[PDB]
Design a protein around this ligand. Structure first.
Ligand SMILES: O=C1OC(c2ccc(O)cc2)(c2ccc(O)cc2)c2ccccc21
Lengths: 280, 278
């Protein structure tokens, strides 16, 4: 009943029953369409243990989303370089974004979360007060109407898709409250089980911890829903080895001071305790 | 039998759901996060343990497809499910007193065909405005079946204040493998007793239509729920329905070759072998 066994069973399922299917580069995957897992957030934190997850990247990326940044260099300057290739001069040129400064990802996550529907110009523009601040709306609704069934933050913006260096893999999420507990469901249109999915689970579990903290609630569940769940073909043999490792008890996530607004969270406010992932 | 997934979801909520009130303070039993997979392969998942309103399923979907946001254009087909949301007493509730009766605001039909366009009223001409997500999905399926971004999203944060009701069916995603077209719906709120069987039929039908248009075979319909709930007044009726054994699903037949999604008509469809319980 360790929560990571769900993830292992999803990987096993794709290895056994997935179909060969290729991505935009013509590279092969094994793929299943439509999966779901539930990770409890109650006195533990689902940071996967059968292979180490880049927690520093999880935390800094989420803080970067929250402040609305679309500059890959603003994340890279924290030592987190996962978005840098998508803002490179050559990649941006290949998409027709010649006039963009290097690092300008377009209206990706942070912009849609804080300024949905505003007109994007570039990554250095001031978007204060423009568009729908979905993130603060979710927090507001949780505080005042926890029964609400419309508590959604949606990064999928069909109008803005052509401007993005990458359309969001995490298309939308929904929050839910019962019994003083805050839950979150992510709709992820595409998930690389080997590398991306563990990171994305941590990301939305952390966001739920953050929002629960500032709304006075306790973390409940993170429900992970996938569209195209896939394993790259050259990852099959390492994953078969990983699948025979027993999960170690999940770590705990501690928030080290009372924080009042989502914008006030800082990297030093968080401590992962007892994280003991299997080595690679 | 694929209907057993639905029955076990109902059973789970009656067993493990928590009491949770809705907008009207009326009580439900609720579970957050559920998923079921309904095969579309040589059968159609129109539930059999209780009759589903198939004519309403089909006419509502045709109404979405032509982009209408006028409940009176659907009611004129004898399908009244949207009429209350467009009534003058309900629009006034939401501060929409200057709005014509029947004007639902920028709901499914507008978002599917004109996402991002500026809504005015249900009588406006939106030709060529906004993103036609429906046609874009069909195009991408035809040209890039491997695409992992084949999404139609009715959830529009900018337009929510203008809507008579924000979409329960927030988005759906299509997927192609082995010549088969699948569809996954993200439904943020599901009334298991009254709404969900209708909703399953709707998106299974959309998948049959797009598969027909694109030369593919229907695959799976994957139903994902947020707040899956049962109104307390429905508990004993569902408890009886849970005792009913499902009959084999009917088949859906498309009676002619249709070239575009806009060309489908009610007469093109025939449900074969539908034998539901009362
Ligand atoms: O470069 C990285 O992108 C990943 C990532 C995903 C979502 C996100 O929001 C941020 C990053 C990713 C992993 C696998 C993929 O197939 C594509 C991307 C990732 C996870 C962990 C470590 C590095 C990376």
């Amino acid at each position: 009943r360790h929560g990571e066994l769900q993830y292992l069973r999803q990987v096993e399922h794709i290895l056994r029953c997935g179909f060969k299917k290729e991505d935009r580069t013509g590279t092969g995957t094994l793929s299943v369409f439509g999966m779901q897992a539930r990770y409890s957030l109650r006195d533990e934190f689902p940071l996967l243990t059968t292979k180490r997850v880049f927690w520093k990247g999880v935390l800094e990326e989420l803080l970067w989303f929250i402040k609305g940044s679309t500059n890959a260099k603003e994340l890279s300057s924290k030592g987190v370089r996962i978005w840098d290739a998508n803002g490179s001069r050559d990649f941006l040129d290949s998409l027709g974004f010649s006039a963009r400064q290097e690092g300008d990802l377009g209206p990706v996550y942070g912009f849609q979360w804080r300024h949905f529907g505003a007109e994007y110009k570039d990554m250095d523009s001031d978007y204060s007060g423009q568009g729908v601040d979905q993130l603060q709306k979710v927090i507001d609704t949780i505080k005042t109407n926890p029964d609400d069934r419309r508590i959604i933050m949606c990064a999928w913006n069909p109008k803005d898709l052509p401007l993005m260096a990458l359309p969001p893999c995490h298309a939308l999420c929904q929050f839910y409250v019962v019994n003083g507990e805050l839950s979150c469901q992510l709709y992820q249109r595409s998930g690389d089980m080997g590398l991306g999915v563990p990171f994305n689970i941590a990301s939305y579990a952390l966001l739920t911890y953050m929002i629960a903290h500032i709304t006075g609630l306790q973390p409940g569940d993170f429900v992970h829903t996938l569209g195209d769940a896939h394993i790259y073909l050259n990852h099959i043999e390492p994953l078969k080895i990983q699948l025979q490792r027993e999960p170690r008890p999940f770590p705990k996530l501690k928030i080290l001071r009372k924080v009042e607004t989502i914008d006030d969270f800082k990297v030093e406010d968080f401590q992962i305790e007892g994280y003991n992932p299997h080595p690679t």
